[PDB]
Amino acid sequence: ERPTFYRQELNKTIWEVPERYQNLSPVGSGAYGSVCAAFDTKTGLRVAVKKLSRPFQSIIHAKRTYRELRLLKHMKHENVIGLLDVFTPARSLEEFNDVYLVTHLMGADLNNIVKCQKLTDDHVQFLIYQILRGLKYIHSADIIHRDLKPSNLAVNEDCELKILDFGLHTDDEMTGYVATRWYRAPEIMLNWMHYNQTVDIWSVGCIMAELLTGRTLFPGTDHIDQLKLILRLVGTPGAELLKKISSESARNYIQSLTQMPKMNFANVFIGANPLAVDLLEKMLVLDSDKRITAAQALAHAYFAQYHDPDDEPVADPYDQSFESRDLLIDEWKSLTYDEVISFVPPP
Numbered sequence: 001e002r003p004t005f006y007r008q009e010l011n012k013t014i015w016e017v018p019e020r021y022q023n024l025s026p027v028g029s030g031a032y033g034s035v036c037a038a039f040d041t042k043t044g045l046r047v048a049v050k051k052l053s054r055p056f057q058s059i060i061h062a063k064r065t066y067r068e069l070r071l072l073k074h075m076k077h078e079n080v081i082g083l084l085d086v087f088t089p090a091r092s093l094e095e096f097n098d099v100y101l102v103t104h105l106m107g108a109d110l111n112n113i114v115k116c117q118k119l120t121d122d123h124v125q126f127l128i129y130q131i132l133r134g135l136k137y138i139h140s141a142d143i144i145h146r147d148l149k150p151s152n153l154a155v156n157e158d159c160e161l162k163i164l165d166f167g168l169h170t171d172d173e174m175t176g177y178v179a180t181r182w183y184r185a186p187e188i189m190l191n192w193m194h195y196n197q198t199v200d201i202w203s204v205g206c207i208m209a210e211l212l213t214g215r216t217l218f219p220g221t222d223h224i225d226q227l228k229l230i231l232r233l234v235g236t237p238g239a240e241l242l243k244k245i246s247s248e249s250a251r252n253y254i255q256s257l258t259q260m261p262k263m264n265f266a267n268v269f270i271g272a273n274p275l276a277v278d279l280l281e282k283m284l285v286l287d288s289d290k291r292i293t294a295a296q297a298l299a300h301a302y303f304a305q306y307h308d309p310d311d312e313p314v315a316d317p318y319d320q321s322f323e324s325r326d327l328l329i330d331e332w333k334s335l336t337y338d339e340v341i342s343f344v345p346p347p
């Protein structure tokens with residue numbers, strides 16, 4: 001049955017939430033809405049509550065609202081953000097206007113942990129293992145994160161990690177000396193080709209390197225500067241990769257660059273575990289077809305003490321046929337409404 005709702009103004013906005021949620025307090029921006037910390041009296045969990053801002057103001061917005069709800073409803077994995085609750089104060093589709101999403105409140109993101117400093121190899125092992133464990137799961141559902149970065153990786157006191165914001169940035173915020181671009185695979189940064197799951201492994205490589213050194217791997221001042229930093233490390237592309245750059249314009253620019261060989265990673269990451277160096281070399285391959293997969297990386301010797309093939313689950317099938325579907329605002333809205341109503345809380 002329908003719980004009782006109460007009203008409260010927080011982020012210049014009226015929040016109407018079930019009584020179970022108490023002590024609501026703003027904690028910053030999330031994807032497509034503002035996030036509040038709260039205490040869920042029913043579960044005893046500290047939770048993050050996101051109220052979506054104008055979820056159905058356009059077809060793009062309506063579809064994006066539906067997309068986020070579908071994604072969050074599907075994810076049931078220890079190392080991936082999951083949906084604890086979703087609600088609306090609306091009593092019918094007719095009065096349906098607002099969507100609230102509830103998940104675990106996380107302690108800190110990976111940026112707060114790196115803090116300009118080197119992490120110990122054992123800490124890097126555990127953190128990267130969990131990212132890859134979550135990624136294996138996400139990828140098995142044919143979902144791509146597309147924007148993996150330290151700020152999207154949340155970690156508790158026991159170093160247990162969850163991946164946030166998968167499967168969902170304007171040109172302006174990708175411009176210049178910005179972390180929004182530092183972790184992006186070159187093929188996606190410069191739109192070389194139709195990208196796939198392998199873009200996420202690139203991001204993991206960049207993250208792992210940063211955990212090991214305490215420094216951004218490719219802190220480019222712009223797209224071109226970043227590409228130069230990338231190619232200096234991994235080498236300029238060969239004829240084989242060049243053929244796969246379907247963009248004639250991008251392909252033509254690449255060939256204008258003086259050729260460079262791949263650097264020696266042992267000389268770049270001085271003092272690092274040779275097994276860490278080996279893994280980095282397999283993740284940071286320019287040709288995406290040849291990058292190590294999440295499933296393969298889990299079996300790499302670097303994770304010997306954590307790897308357990310019987311405790312690295314895959315996802316149920318995820319139907320994303322809706323992505324190629326053209327619908328009106330109210331149609332996306334009705335689909336979203338059905339998803340809200342049908343929600344079953346996790347045990």
Ligand SMILES: CC(C)Nc1ncc2cc(Oc3ccc(F)cc3F)c(=O)n(C)c2n1
Nearest residue numbers: 030035048050101102103105106107108109
């Ligand atoms: C201190 C910080 C690192 N902990 C933390 N914890 C949770 C979230 C959730 C976010 O997003 C949500 C996703 C799904 C939901 F159901 C609800 C949400 F609020 C979000 O964007 N951030 C930044 C978060 N941060």
